[PDB]
């Protein structure tokens, strides 16, 4: 009666001021390598003179444990929020994950939660009993004990097949951690952020600042310079490659199979050029030099043969590279995109060139052969059978479709996985791995205090990871939930290897009661848990 | 149509969550020098496709204007909150003030507020007409206009008389801005904070780190070293005053009349000494050297004559200095205070030594002749007619008494001023000007994200000011409200100059309906406004 | 032009203040349970008319009331705690009047409506309730709001609890100018009896067998309301016609229990009730001691005969409550013994109840069935006393539930969950309709004087007001207590489904603590959540 401690659904968001639903315990089954994921909520009902009481966690198998931290939001939603959104007004939302490194503090008058992962690659197949205990460190009384049966199947977890890039901001690390591009300490921090990106965020593709990306910048303004290709004073062009080389050695070592090149013109119109300097610091391109400048055709004609040469030397052939022209064109800016392409189409021969888009006309016009499409605009590109096809979401995908905002359900994030599968999407892109700026980079923000880009974007949009004091990225609930969805993709793919694709499509549709669509998926979240278990049971029932 | 915009009482806290009540415009009267202070709440009612619509602010007279910023709290109260507390669970609280440097953004679905002050120091006496307007930047249409009459008496606002110290942490600036003690950029930042403290927090007294203060430190741990007195290696003690000369020059140029020295012994038990090193970096004193160490007694017999001489050269004589023995002894540590006392008492003859208590018993013993007394513990000291008397408040003053927590009313902050007056308290001390650490300084915290010392202290306790990115302090609502309380104390002091004390005491009591006490003051704030008005009208009429 | 908003049912809307809005959320009710909303309104447009007229419509049948501002000159007793909303003489929202025409929206003042949507006749499902206000000059719509409503298939069961609010016939006599007992007085008594059972949720009625010895100055006489009449002369003959009348209206109005008045005088039990014969000659009263052998002989005659008449009216020994005298302390204890000893043998077999705040006198067996003040329950709960009742009155000013105009509506409704949590079998209040000054020195006008002539906090003495047509008018204090009772009912309905432990567990978890009578959560939202959870669980188990 002194404590209220309970396991909860991993898709619940635990708010400090409401008691959540208990998970009813049932036997679990995981492929060997697949972790078991639980969430545990807790408060101290005893009304004594101390604000909290210390508790000791124990597990009968090795686990990895996080505290879930409440973080502020001043703009949880954009206008006209639909009925999926949990809350709507400025408040606190759960998101940040800090490692558990001592006793847990159970507070009176408010609820808190832990994130628990039980790794399984060391476990010989068979049946287990997982006991979780909390002990009042002051008295040695055991206040919580819960046993969860865990079967580890003979079948090994395969990883998912999908291209995944979450845009990377080197300037945001420079500014936050107070380090000139590119000190040794900055290189160490970038390293840490890259290992997280590959291993924990399940990225195979990485944005590489060949020059400072012409992205999220105010007309006329300037992000901290992060160009990896450096250029000596002088008009016959001579390149210094040392930073690119070091960059690629760290990506390779961090596990990246692909690098993604920044856009060659400016966002939303392709009107100007990226802010490029020489080694003295003298601007050569920028907002004052239009896209159609002859000087910039000449700059690139020189650069592109040599740059591919350097990238191949570092283990990235033309089949392991993605290029961009300009980001997020629509009908208004059709002819800007056209005009800029015309300056450069003949230089990008045989390269894979992609761009993020909503308007199918750009694909039929052939301006954009390889489109990344908004997840509320997919239907016209499915009609036309475009392959390959990628998807993305951002501030603007507010209605009916998947997204990761603080004020939405975790289910709206996780449900991406099955939907990538069901509709044969090959890639997923997102602009905000680590954007710690106000809209249009007018100034830096503190990501622990501001999650809404300075009151411009719904919270949860601009960054997936927080910058730890030690230079190490801190995990988020949004990322751990995105992982569950990627683990859904991967078991469905593994199931398709054993049976039809037809078989898996029938099984998704029957478990949903419908063909799940990106803008129309079931209102209840329980069907995902049931698809995932069925998939896992069919692969186990069939293993040697 | 379209917007919803109203003036609100200065003592209202506007949540992003709720519409507050409108101030009914009355004529204001100010003595000359005294600012008019207003608050303005705002919201866009039109449900378009933009989240917000920019507005422009104009005033008839020069205003300093601030946007009021919502800040997170994970621990709004300690156990068993009384019913004065506004909210009692984790959420956002209005506290941080940022200069308004452009248009204001009126959002749909959420309320926001500005703090406005109209200086009066340059208006010649008379009747003015303060008009406040907001214009929609898109449509050039005016969507808010209110006019507040303002009278400026020929009578001049005199400043409050009272010792006030709010403990300063150099280690917290060093760590937040990532500057080693003591670089040129750290000196400039310290200066910025020192000028806010005097002019904007109304302090006359500054905590001066002769050595790193033995405060809020876990047994056996260490904060960044900020000691102003440097010791050269070797046993006939040679000292380097350079850091301390610089400190005192910035202190004096910022207007501080008094400096406060840190405790000579460790907090609570008084068991050990402060962490002092030499120029090579070698530990001379600390947790591993007891208070009763002959060496430490020797060190202070060398240090105290030489430091007094140097402070006097910086223009702080023995009657402008406060000294500390050990913070916060209680019944069970009483002997440790005695033992430490008896090592150094002979070296402190003719110095003003003070320490902070809740137990009256250390006063009854003569152990602490000059007590700083918790504001929920005053009654036995008032009765034992102790004088001089200072008071303080911290985490541990949760019930029935003045404090500044995010979750208490602004009233509970502002009332402090009349109560100092009424009960003849001579000083006010607070431990948290700018503590940007977790409890016991086990690590630094982000003061914009964490306001409760890592979930140990009710939010609004550990710091008064925030660290701006330019290196300048950012103001708080808590400070602005407490400045109103000092404004109350000032006019009542000025009124007692004209009539006696009995006259003023009598006006307080009749206006309140009762003799107001620290643990028993009227339920509604209105009476503070009426007494402020009464005392101003009377003073103006005498000019 | 207008400013119109749904507000929380627990909000008190003052004329001089805009209250916070209710964010619409899907409402779930059991079938039979009503949806209750409050609606605040004002005109912003500043024309030359003081008000403009509006028409209300609702897509479902609604029962609607205007909330009326009523005066108080004594809002609190001394030393009020911080829960008290206002504490000086003003106007307070309380009286409820049927809405018979259009709403008048005024400039410079806020007003409110109380809205109830019955549900007994909706078949289960999802509904959309639309609420609209339409300016009548201009035929346009100035407010529209849809609130979603699910009516479960699971049926709302009534609360289990004994509840009496003491009834004063003399106050109906005096106010409507009717001598006991005329045809028109009987009809007005019935109107009040019907409200009592059906609208105030009483199962028990105080029956004036003789004029109740309550609220009477020593040596005085309230109007004679005795239903039992006594022919003149010493071999005692009784006339039952007024009793039979009383009992029939009581039974037709739905009362299962009748409550007999105290046998001895208040505060000491020194003397006897003011009893006359039919000539008018006084047989008992202030002039006859309680030890008088005549009073015992009067009751040995009366009691067997009254029990027989009451059983004819359908009220047996298990459906009657008897009183002796209230509040034995160290003073009165000696004469309460004296008096008790004079009659105890006649009362064996009968349920005898009395007010008691000292547990010694329960243990003693001096008072077997105690009605305990809600600020004194701890020692009785410590002794597992059972059955146990509670009351509150002028004297329960601090930390505990009450009804006062100046308290939060929260502090009234919260009683429901606390009665459940602590297994309290019954609730008694003294003031159903006391329209007199203290000690019954004179009648008062209940629309103009709400504090018994400046004696008791306003909201204490009566729950209903007297309508011009001789029908009771409702009050907000009554509507809010009906919420509290609705909470108790769902919690009891849920205990039939799970057990008590499960329901205690949900109470404590939702509250974040074990709620006590003198220590319940700071904020009221936890009640709304608790009520929602209970209802969702009962709906889910229906087949």
Numbering used by the authors:
A (entry chain D): 1 to 544
B (entry chain C): 1 to 543
C (entry chain B): 2 to 544
Paper excerpt:
Beta-N-acetylgalactosaminidases (β-NGAs) hydrolyze the different β-GalNAc linkages of various glycans to modulate the length, combination, and abundance of glycans. Despite low sequence similarity, the crystal structures of these enzymes demonstrate that all enzymes share a prototype structure and have diversified their substrate specificities (oligosaccharide-releasing, oligosaccharide/monosaccharide-releasing, and monosaccharide-releasing) through the accumulation of mutations and insertional amino acid sequences. The overall structure of these enzymes is similar to that of CpNga123 and BvGH123, which consist of a β-sandwich domain at the N-terminus and a (β/α)8-barrel domain encompassing the catalytic region. Among Groups 1–4 and GH123, the DE motif is located at the same position, suggesting that these enzymes adopt the substrate-assisted catalysis reported for GH123 MR-β-NGAs.
In Group 4, NgaBf, NgaBl, and NgaLy were only active on GalNAc-β-pNP, highlighting their strict MR-β-NGA functionality. The structure of NgaDssm (Group 3) bore a striking resemblance to that of NgaLy and NgaP2 (Group 4) (root-mean-square distance of Cα atoms [rmsd] = 1.5–2.3 Å), while the structures of NgaLy and NgaP2 are identical (rmsd = 1.0 Å). Among the conserved amino acids, D95, W115, Y466, and R478 (amino acid numbers of NgaLy) are located at the interface between the N-terminal domain and DUF4091 (right). D95 and W115, located at the N-terminal domain, fit into the surface pocket of DUF4091, and the side chain of D95 formed hydrogen bonds with Y466 and R478 located at DUF4091. Therefore, D95, W115, Y466, and R478 are potentially important for maintaining structural integrity as they link the N-terminal and (β/α)8-barrel domains (blue letter). G427 is positioned at the entry point for the eighth β-sheet into the (β/α)8 barrel domain, with the space barely the size of the glycine residue. The DE motif (D327 and E328), Y392, and W431 are located around the substrate and are involved in substrate recognition (red letter). The Y392A and W431A mutants were purified as soluble enzymes (red letter), although their catalytic activity was considerably reduced. The Km and kcat of each enzyme for the most preferred substrate (GalNAc-β-pNP or Galβ1-3GalNAc-β-pNP) were also examined, wherein NgaLy possessed the highest kcat/Km value. Metal ions generally did not affect enzyme activity, except that of NgaLy, which was inhibited by Ni2+, Co2+, and Zn2+.
